Amino acid sequence: GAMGPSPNWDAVAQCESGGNWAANTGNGKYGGLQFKPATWAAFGGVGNPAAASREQQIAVANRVLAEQGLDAWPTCGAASGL
Template sequence: MTRIAKPLIKSATAAAFVAASMSLSTGIAHADVMNWDAVAQCESGGNWTANTGNGAYGGLQFKQATWNEYGGVGNPATASKQEQIAVANRVLAGQGPAAWPKCAGAGGLPPVPVVLPKPVRQLQQTVTEIISLFTPHQ
């Protein structure tokens, strides 16, 4: 190997480990941070198959466009509770608790959005995209 190739390979390997560890810690953190049953109780009365005609669906009241953007398949109202929570964790990572402005507090997070600096938001979006590549979509 050349003198340049070795450092490049080491850097790429290190970056991959950092990205992997960030994606794992992000998933674990969000699993413990939000009480999705409490959010669903607030949003839809705990009805994970809610379709009230208001343009939002499922227990966590997803707009169809948001559901699709964050990897949901089909209609949120027909998705399993587990799938809704998986998509909700991705939405939480991308939009923060402001995605549920009236009910995030019920889930244990304040509804006030945290404004991150642009480079951090870009990194967060990249990590979210990487996570979505490895998250099974039904």
């Protein structure tokens, strides 16, 4: 660190998906967050993060951090920004 870099929800999508918010890789993962479908089942399991825009997803994802834990995501986590 030097000064303090601003939190980046978009960059964290390129940390968990490393490509697309839709995650068109078929890894059973949605909202560019490598977040297990069995976990998303808490919010219905529905393709909500597949249809929800980047920022719309980050909103549901922000609450889903409390649902499963911040620890569910690796070193990458826009909740802290890094």
